[PDB]
Ligand SMILES: COc1ccc(-c2noc(CSc3nnc(C)n3-c3ccc(OC)cc3)n2)cc1
């Protein structure tokens with residue numbers, strides 16, 4: 001099963017993960033409707049997800065992609081936000097749970113911006129917010145997001161909203177255009193870091 005390795009705040013790895021999360025906050029077109037209003041997060045903890053079977057599947061797929069991408073994985077660290085974090089860390093990403101309504105079809109969506117992933121933690125459009133207060137901008141309830149290793153391989157550049165089931169022939173991912181990073185096989189992502197946090201209320 002899954003083991004969670006507790007990273008200390010004094011560690012460079014904890015600091016690089018938090019720095020990537022904090023520096024990638026952006027203003028979103030919905031004016032904060034989905035994810036809430038904030039300029040920074042309060043990071044509660046950062047844990048490394050260790051699972052032998054999940055690593056094996058990730059390794060297995062990585063090699064196939066590498067063989068088809070002139071010996072390159074084209075790995076990227078990307079954020080993922082969804083109400084399925086707990087299942088993902090135990091069972092792995094699963095394309096049978098791909099977002100069907102996604103702009104680039106039934107895939108698993110990742111982002112360079114942590115604030116983009118925060119919009120999905122409580123559901124599509126932020127759902128009804130946290131279970132306790134029904135608040136999409138809740139400053140109390142703890143949230144979770146993942147900072148993932150994503151095997152992109154040969155990315156297909158998509159500009160039109162198209163409903164793809166799988167990556168196009170000879171490709172391993174879709175970069176849909178801010179860019180949306182999409183994979184269609186759960187084994188092309190490893191949920192490396194589990195980030196537990198709160199959004200913080202800006203000074204009035
Ligand atoms: C029960 O066990 C499991 C095991 C695995 C998963 C899982 N694996 O990938 C995903 C992507 S969800 C996703 N990927 N991109 C988006 C966007 N969303 C998403 C986000 C929020 C949402 O809210 C209801 C639905 C889909 N979910 C789910 C459940």
Ligand SMILES: [Zn+2]
Nearest residue numbers: 130133138141
């Ligand atoms: Zn709440």
